[PDB]
Design a protein around this ligand. Structure first.
Ligand SMILES: Nc1ncnc2c1ncn2[C@@H]1O[C@H](COP(=O)(O)OP(=O)(O)O)[C@@H](O)[C@H]1O
Ligand SMILES: Nc1ncnc2c1ncn2[C@@H]1O[C@H](COP(=O)(O)OP(=O)(O)O)[C@@H](O)[C@H]1O
Ligand code: BEF
Ligand code: BEF
Ligand SMILES: [Mg+2]
Ligand SMILES: [Zn+2]
Ligand SMILES: [Zn+2]
Lengths: 123, 360, 333, 246, 368
């Protein structure tokens, strides 16, 4: 229901994550500005990263079954999990309560996240 | 069943809801309405005086669809986004967090970029006096020629540490610590609107204990309500203020002068229950006696540090001959000299007060 | 050259801008106002843009020197503002300034801002290089004696009527802080468009922002003004000044005064002042102090100062301000 | 002036392996001054290198084929680090000289000299668990990958993982001050009682890095004792990890 | 078996357990009942009065799974991992390691995260007075308004070192030192609950020995239990504390007052063989002398204890004028201060007593 369902191979997720990781410096002025905005909608994942001065967004097509949603996840954490998996890993990220559940075969992570609506206002 | 904290729930939203600081409000309104707003406004007051509230209200006046004015509107987009703390370009910075010249330079690289919303990009720096000298110089350099839609708001509790050159760049306002009347009236209004049963004497005790700060008054009101189950009577506030009392040295001096042995014993037992170090108590008693002697020499010897208990100090200076002051000072000096080798100092301080009372 | 005061620069600027202007003084407000007036007159006469450079041991002298020969693509004329350090120039900075003086031309309204230079800095090649046509403006802070006249004159300039009591109060609260004094005058003009600033009208809109140096307190003690001395102590403590320097200046001048009082019965005060190298402006004040102070009072002052220094130097440093106030009161009887 | 108490004529790659086996488990500026180094022990035809810091132990016992009297000396951390800095992967016959107070090494055309720590190294034999009944044997690379995966979100100030041992699956669980959880599951072949045991994942990862083998065996006794780690097909070097309190 | 230390085992776990601190207990219970939970608390008191324990109890009450109850209600999961020291909502932070703002900022940027299986993320910043001014002003903004799920509990011994600005945005609660009767009552509770025989005199002496905290009382009680064999006695407690039998010091002060030398010599050379340190003999005599001085001040200052010798306290107060008491106390105090430089501690005590005898205000030693 309120579970942003997402599923992708890591090859199509490594490069866009690095692309949207540009503005994410050492210390962000706002706390949530140290994160990435993830949106699954219209069969597409949008990755957004902002520095309150510049924003970079990467879109990836989605073929696996999914459920639309949006959530703000820690930048360097999510990148570290995504990069640390073995080559060809099929990452399945879900939203349970206030936690991103990252599952890949026998590997399970439960990252803490910020509400999507609290990410500035990109409108 | 919210029962939120009364401090922030009752933060002013319109300039007409700010208690005191009337001249500052008039000056801000005049600048917002007819004149051209100065490129930088600095605020200096006491703890819990209204500084950040006034700065936030001024920023609300700056960015609003009704235009740059004093009382813009209610429940607008920009006003609400500021009141909820979610406004984007209302940058809120703690100076102590960014004393480094590198962090300050990074902060001052943001002024060039245009505001995301509203008209003016407002920076609100708290406790600005704690900025490093290099960071302060960089702030002055960016303040001399700011962009046409970039404005700075600075606040500090003690403006004496700010270099004089800050006056060359920004218009400063000083907020006077609220008196007992204004604090009492505002607390009465808050309690009346919140439907809290209360007595005027309880409000007077809260206001006097606040020592000029309205935030202190609100915190004490919250504690009084919590302990008194909403029924804020005089006895409850008096007891819970006595639990927080720390004027023991002054009361000890007053009672020892009055040759009131039982009062001195009760007060010293209360100080023991407070767990106060006895050497510190005796040295601050010596300091109080020395201050009484000096203010006897000249009325100007007093300052604003003792502006909380200055009435009793003036009465003590008026009523006590200097010879008694000298005798008491000598007695307390020898008591402090003999304190370490005495028994448990709780009774050594007692017996020093005994020797002082012997001069009757 | 042409040495002037802030009240004369406004008249001088309409006679034609000179090659260079040197704003010398310890008062930030007078320097700022003179610089603003120079810039406004330059803009009226065709100087559009202005460049600011603070002199630092890492000053980009190549940038400024190129700026001397930097023409103006879209602009036409230009000024050049230099911010001297608090201690003034040295060999390297003065050589750079001499080269810059050699680089002056029809443009380059060179503006120099800082604190007053010493006699040694006075006798320098750069200073003599522009010594023919430059305009020097003295911007020192008016002292206690001349402050009421100055604030009254500025109030007349600002179309504000002030009383003697209001003048005294403004001088008391904002001594050495004339930036805050002008801000207070502007605030009072804004709050009351009437302009008749009575005593109650100024009592409710001023704050104790005065800044003092230890020498101010020493002079207050010598004059015997106990209230002024205590006010100076309060301002110094709120400013966070270290009490050790207060004790040091007190010790130096008190030892000199004790020597003078001891030798008074032997040699007249004039020769004693001359031998001890006493400045003329303070000779009367120190003679008054010697006349008022007795040998017993001097011994008690030395005793109290010694006790205060012993308390400080034993790493305690507790309630040293009370002892300082005690000494201040003792020396003012 | 030199009296060689113990003289080794040993391949330099052999002692390179010996030191690299135990270098990481060493004390840096520790209060226990005798631990700020590494123990060289000699027992017949066997050379042993021991190194510990109170949380780790690393012993490498390798035959050399030459019989020498039993001995035990402690070489400081700086000396062994310098030796590794100078030791290379060649064929030069290294020559170790052990005296009463100093260590010397003739290495091809270089000479390395250092002093010895004046102390007695603790007996490593009692540090090893005396009842290594439970055995977890699994591929070394798989364990390394799983531990690195579980340690991805682990912080430097809080580095520690809990092992849940069950019939077959081995679970590695990691938490953080941010209160986020990581879990890994492995199909290690095992037979015993379910248990929970916490260790610093950095120390375990270093132990696995020191083991360049296809699979390893972990010997376990109970939830409060140390765990031993060794090559499943060799007994040349063993490691001990002390559990952490939970 | 193990017998976990009294402080660790008998730490309070409910507002029906905490002895004393009626003001803070009432405040916490009533505020939780009314639902007016402030985001910033400042427990201030001397050591061992219950700031940490009361803070843990408040954290239990906030995050009970059943609901928001005044006291920690029926101890569910969250409460029992709290009492075990395991984290459910208790971020216990020592302020000594985070004085620098560079670490306070790291603390602050983590606050905006939902708690796990808890209703709040309760920060316990102990010894909060040890932070730096930069850190205080840095966490000033978070103190004024934290996230809804973040609560601040600050505990410190000296609130005077705190800046007034942070003092404003905190509910201040001061914990008075516990009276000797409450301490003795608690120790009796503990010993009845631990099936260890106890003597009333021993418990009274232990309660007096503790300077108003129950932590010192519990450590002293553990030491007394160790001195015995699972019991506490007057002999064991007196030997542990070193306090002598009040009859001895009281006879000695009586003989000094009566100005007889032979009785003083007999008392002191009997006290020599009892293995009581001479400096504590002087301390006990000075304590008694000040006790009679206080009796002179007021009949209020006798003490609930000292009943076995209270009649003689009153008689000495009636007989001796305050000036003589002051003289004796000054002589004994000077003697105790001079004791380290005497040839022997017994030598110094004897000479101090003989000096009090020679300068006796009423019956001085005969002179040639
Ligand atoms: N003049 C005032 N009018 C209304 N509320 C005030 C005023 N001054 C202080 N307060 C109360 O105190 C709280 C904190 O005020 P603040 O302006 O931050 O004090 P400070 O001067 O120390 O920064 C505010 O939320 C408000 O409730
Ligand atoms: N009010 C109290 N009621 C019962 N025991 C207390 C109380 N105060 C202190 N103690 C005893 O002291 C021990 C530690 O108390 P603690 O709450 O840590 O004091 P602190 O305020 O100094 O941290 C407790 O285990 C308990 O035995
Ligand atoms: F925010 Be205030 F200065 F207490
Ligand atoms: F926290 Be307490 F001071 F032991
Ligand atoms: Mg503020
Ligand atoms: Zn609006
Ligand atoms: Zn519960």
């Amino acid at each position: 229901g309120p579970h942003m369902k997402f599923t992708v191979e890591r090859e199509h997720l490594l490069k866009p994550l690095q692309q949207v990781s540009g503005p994410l410096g050492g210390r962000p002025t706002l706390p949530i500005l140290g994160n990435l905005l993830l949106q699954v909608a219209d069969g597409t994942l949008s990755l957004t990263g902002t520095d309150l001065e510049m924003e970079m967004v990467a879109r990836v097509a989605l073929v696996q079954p999914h459920e639309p949603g949006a959530t703000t996840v820690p930048a360097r954490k999510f990148f570290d999990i995504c990069r640390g998996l073995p080559e060809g890993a099929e990452i399945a990220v879900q939203l349970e309560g206030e936690r991103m559940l990252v599952r890949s075969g026998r590997s399970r992570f439960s990252l803490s996240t910020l509400p999507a609506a609290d990410f500035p206002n990109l409108d | 069943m919210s029962y939120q904290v009364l401090a922030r729930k009752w933060r002013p939203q319109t300039f007409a809801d700010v208690v005191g600081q009337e001249h500052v409000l008039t000056a801000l309104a005049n600048g917002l309405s007819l004149g051209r707003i100065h490129h930088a406004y600095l605020f200096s007051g006491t703890r819990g005086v209204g500084k950040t509230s006034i700065a936030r209200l001024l920023a609300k006046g700056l960015n609003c669809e009704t235009g740059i004015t004093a009382t813009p509107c209610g429940v607008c987009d920009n006003c609400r986004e500021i009141e909820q703390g979610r406004f984007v370009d209302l940058i809120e910075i703690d100076a102590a967090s960014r004393t480094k010249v590198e962090d300050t330079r990074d902060l001052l690289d943001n002024v060039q970029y245009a505001p995301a919303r509203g008209r003016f990009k407002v920076y609100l720096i708290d406790e600005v006096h704690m900025l490093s000298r290099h960071s302060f110089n960089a702030l002055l350099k960016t303040l001399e020629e700011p962009p046409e839609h970039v404005k700075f708001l600075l606040a500090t509790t003690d403006p004496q540490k700010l270099p004089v050159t800050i006056l060359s760049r920004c218009l400063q306002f000083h907020l006077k610590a609220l008196d007992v009347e204004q604090i009492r009236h505002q607390l009465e209004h808050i309690l009346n609107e919140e439907h809290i049963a209360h007595e005027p004497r309880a409000l007077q005790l809260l206001a006097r204990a606040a020592e000029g700060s309205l935030r202190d008054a609100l915190s004490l009101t919250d504690q009084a309500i919590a302990s008194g189950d909403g029924q804020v009577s005089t006895q409850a506030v008096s007891a819970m203020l006595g639990t927080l009392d720390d004027d023991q040295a002054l009361s000890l001096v007053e009672a020892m002068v009055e040759a009131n042995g039982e009062r001195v014993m009760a007060l010293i037992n209360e100080a023991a229950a407070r767990g106060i170090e006895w050497e510190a108590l005796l040295v601050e008693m010596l300091g109080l006696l020395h201050r009484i002697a000096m203010v006897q020499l000249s009325p100007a010897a007093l300052g604003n540090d003792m502006a909380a208990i200055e009435l009793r100090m003036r009465e003590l200076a008026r009523t006590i001959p200097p010879t008694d002051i000298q005798l008491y000072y000598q007695t307390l000096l020898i008591g402090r000299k003999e304190l370490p080798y005495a028994p448990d100092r709780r009774m050594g301080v007692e017996m020093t007060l005994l020797r002082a009372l012997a001069f009757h | 050259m042409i040495r002037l005061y802030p009240e004369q620069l406004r008249a001088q600027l309409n006679e034609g801008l000179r090659a260079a202007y040197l704003l010398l003084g310890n008062d930030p407000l007078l320097l700022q106002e003179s610089q603003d007036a120079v810039r406004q007159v330059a803009a009226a006469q065709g100087f559009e843009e202005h460049h600011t450079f603070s002199i630092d041991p890492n000053t980009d002298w190549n940038a400024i020197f190129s700026l001397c020969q930097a023409m103006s693509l879209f602009a036409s004329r230009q000024t050049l503002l230099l911010l001297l350090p608090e201690n003034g120039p040295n060999a390297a900075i003065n050589e750079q300034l001499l080269t810059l003086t050699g680089l002056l031309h029809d443009d380059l309204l060179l503006i120099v801002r800082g604190n007053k230079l010493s006699k040694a800095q006075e006798n320098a090649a750069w200073f003599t290089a522009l010594a023919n046509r430059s305009v020097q403006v003295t911007c020192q802070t008016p002292e206690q004696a001349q402050l009421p006249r100055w604030v009254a004159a500025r109030a007349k300039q600002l179309n504000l009527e002030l009383d003697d009591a209001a003048n005294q109060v403004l001088c008391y609260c904002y001594e050495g802080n004339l930036l805050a004094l002008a801000q207070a005058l502007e605030r009072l003009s804004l709050l009351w468009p009437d302009g008749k600033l009575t005593l109650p009208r100024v009592e409710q809109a001023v704050n104790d922002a005065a800044h003092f140096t230890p020498f101010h307190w020493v002079d207050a003690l010598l004059m015997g003004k106990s209230k002024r001395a205590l006010h100076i102590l309060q301002q110094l403590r709120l400013e966070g000044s270290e009490p050790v320097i207060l004790l040091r200046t007190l010790q130096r001048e008190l030892l000199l005064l004790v020597n003078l009082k001891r030798q008074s019965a032997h040699t007249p005060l004039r020769a004693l002042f001359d031998k001890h190298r006493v400045w003329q402006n303070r000779r009367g004040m120190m003679g008054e102090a010697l006349n008022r102070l007795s040998q017993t009072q001097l011994r008690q002052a030395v005793q109290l100062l010694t006790r205060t220094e012993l308390t400080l130097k034993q790493d305690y440093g507790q309630s040293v301000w009370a002892e300082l106030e005690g000494l201040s009161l003792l020396l003012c009887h | 002036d030199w009296q060689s108490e113990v003289e080794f004529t040993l391949p330099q790659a052999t002692m390179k392996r010996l030191i690299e086996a135990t270098q990481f488990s060493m004390a840096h500026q520790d209060v226990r001054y005798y631990l700020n180094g590494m123990l060289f022990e000699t027992e017949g035809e066997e050379l042993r290198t021991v190194a510990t810091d109170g949380h780790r132990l690393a012993v490498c016992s390798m035959p050399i084929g030459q019989s020498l009297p039993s001995h035990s000396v402690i070489v400081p951390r700086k000396g062994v680090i310098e030796l590794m800095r100078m030791l290379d992967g060649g064929d030069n016959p290294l020559r170790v000289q052990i005296g009463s107070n100093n260590i010397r090494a003739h290495v091809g055309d270089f000479i390395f000299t250092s002093k010895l720590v004046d102390g007695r190294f603790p007996d490593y034999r009692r540090v090893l668990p005396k009842n290594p009944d439970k055995h977890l044997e699994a591929g070394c690379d798989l364990l390394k990958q799983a531990f690195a995966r579980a340690a991805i979100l682990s912080n430097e100030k809080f580095r520690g993982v809990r092992l849940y041992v069950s019939e077959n699956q081995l679970k590695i669980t990691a938490n953080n001050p941010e209160q986020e959880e990581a879990e890994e599951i492995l199909d290690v072949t095992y037979s015993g009682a379910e248990m929970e045991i916490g260790f610093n994942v950095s120390y375990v990862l270093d132990v696995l890095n020191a083991l360049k083998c296809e699979n390893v065996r972990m010997m376990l006794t109970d939830s409060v004792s140390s765990v031993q780690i060794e090559d499943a097909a060799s007994q040349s070097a063993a490691y001990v990890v002390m559990p952490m309190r939970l």
